[PDB]
């Protein structure tokens, strides 16, 4: 069985987001776009940490070269 | 029989704050990637770590590092208890202070030095009580997490402005230095053991 109970790394803390069995990454760049007010412009979608080295240092493809997991915890 | 319950093993990761287990396993108990787990241990003590998945890993077993197991009460052959944490929160306060023989001979800062980098980007998850040594930083320094803004655990955030009183604490008798000979600290002899 499975279930979906993927969790966010908010400033505030780590909340089980709502999401669906299927969704892309249009759909959750348009959830945080009104739970936070982001932009889809600017939102950027990382699965991991070094938060220093994402300035810049970070270029990497989210795509299939980083292989993202059904249920990758967002860390932000 | 509670497949959420698992037998402590060695581990092949050196991470302080990382266990193995089974893809099977995983599956069963439903984790994902690097997904927050709560380890219960003995005398009601819990520890959170990440998951990773190990080919290497019994069905019954678990794989985590000597820090988490002696700080979890348990020893090798006894019974964890082991499940995702649905609700977590990041550390809106960090006290943590040295140990009185982790600083004798030196003196200064060691917020900026120590207390700081393994903080910043790390990410990782620690409970009040808990002891972390820190290798990536020329010395093995060993430091105690006094408390948090959340009890009695939390994600370390690095967003958050860390606070090392100056004042080294002592080193309880249930407490062990990570300056001890263990098996890590054999080299070439694997069979021998």
């Known amino acids: 069985a499975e279930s979906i109970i993927i969790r966010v790394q908010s400033p505030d803390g780590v909340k089980r987001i709502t999401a669906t069995k299927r969704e892309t990454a249009a759909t959750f ?21 070094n938060k220093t080295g994402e300035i810049t240092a970070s270029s990497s493809k989210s795509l299939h070269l980083l292989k993202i997991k059904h249920g990758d915890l967002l860390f932000l | 029989n509670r497949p959420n319950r698992l037998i402590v093993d060695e581990a092949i990761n050196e991470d302080n704050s990382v266990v193995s287990l089974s893809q099977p396993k995983m599956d069963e108990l439903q984790l994902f990637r690097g997904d927050t787990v709560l380890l219960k241990g003995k005398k009601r003590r819990e520890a959170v770590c990440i998951v990773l998945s190990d080919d290497t890993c019994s069905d019954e077993k678990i794989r985590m590092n000597r820090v988490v197991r002696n700080n979890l009460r348990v020893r090798l052959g006894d019974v964890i208890s082991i499940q995702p944490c649905p609700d977590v929160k990041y550390g809106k306060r960090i006290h943590v202070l040295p140990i009185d023989d982790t600083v004798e001979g030196i003196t200064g800062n060691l917020f900026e030095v120590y207390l ?78």
């Open chain 2, 116 to 193: 700081k980098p393994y903080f910043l980007e790390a990410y990782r998850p620690i409970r009040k009580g808990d002891i972390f040594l820190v290798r990536g930083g020329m010395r093995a320094v060993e430091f105690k997490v006094v408390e948090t803004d959340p009890s009695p655990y939390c994600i370390v955030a690095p967003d958050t402005v860390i606070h090392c009183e100056g004042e080294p604490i002592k080193r309880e008798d249930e407490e062990e230095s990570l300056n001890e000979v263990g098996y890590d600290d054999v080299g070439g002899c694997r069979k021998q053991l």
């Open chain 1, 29 to 49: 760049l348009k959830k945080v776009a009104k739970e936070f007010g982001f932009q889809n412009n600017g939102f950027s979608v990382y699965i991991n940490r």
